[PDB]
Design a protein around this ligand. Structure first.
Ligand SMILES: Cc1ccc(C(N)=O)cc1C
Length: 209
């Protein structure tokens, strides 16, 4: 059972701008996704300070980066708070309508795409490098769901029958053919060191056979 939804017009416009604007500094997508993971880990940590059972679904608070050259995917995994089905549908837990409005006003006023995270819509920078994004998520208060979009104005949500996650979010980037540098260990290490050096959770870069 797959449900297909239309993006709000403003979010579709944000995604088309990200896909179509000439902008060479694409590597910032990874900083934005890691920042979102850190924010989600902060939320479950805060909840656990008054209710330790919030971590019954997993005590470890971490971020994993998993490149797969055979599938041409880069996956960002975190054990943060996750997202309910309602959160997924409501722009992955963001205020993306008002954030897009502010972002595009900033762009016409001199800003560049790298400042997207200051407007709460950094997730959509994934489309700088990915032709399709799949988001698998599990929140303590809901079941495990898969969101997916290749842009083009629509996204899908379905219950996920894949590997149970316990709690957290996996962002699977199906990379564009010309963006495979983001599967190379030395390139990922460079970006993490440049942009994510002060993230307060362990970031483990997995290696491949
Ligand atoms: C937009 C978004 C996507 C994934 C996560 C996460 N890693 O929980 C958080 C946000 C705000």
């Amino acid at each position: 059972e797959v449900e297909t939804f239309a993006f709000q017009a403003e979010i579709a416009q944000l995604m088309s701008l990200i896909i179509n604007t000439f902008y060479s500094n694409k590597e910032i997508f990874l900083r934005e996704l890691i920042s979102n993971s850190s924010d989600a880990l902060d939320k479950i940590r805060y909840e656990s300070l008054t209710d330790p059972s919030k971590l019954d679904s997993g005590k470890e608070l971490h971020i994993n980066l998993i490149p797969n050259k055979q599938d041409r995917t880069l996956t960002i995994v975190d054990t943060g708070i996750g997202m309910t089905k309602a959160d997924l549908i409501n722009n992955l837990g963001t205020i993306a309508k008002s954030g897009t409005k502010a972002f595009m006003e900033a762009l016409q006023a001199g800003a560049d795409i790298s400042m997207i995270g200051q407007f709460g819509v950094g997730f959509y920078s994934a489309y700088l490098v990915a032709e399709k994004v799949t988001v698998i998520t599990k929140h303590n208060d809901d079941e495990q769901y898969a969101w997916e979009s290749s842009a083009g104005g629509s996204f899908t949500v379905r219950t996920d029958t894949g590997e149970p996650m316990g709690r957290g979010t996996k962002v699977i980037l199906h990379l564009k053919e010309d963006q495979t540098e983001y599967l190379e260990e030395r390139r990922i290490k460079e970006i993490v060191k440049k942009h994510s050096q002060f993230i307060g959770y362990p970031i483990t870069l997995f290696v491949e056979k």
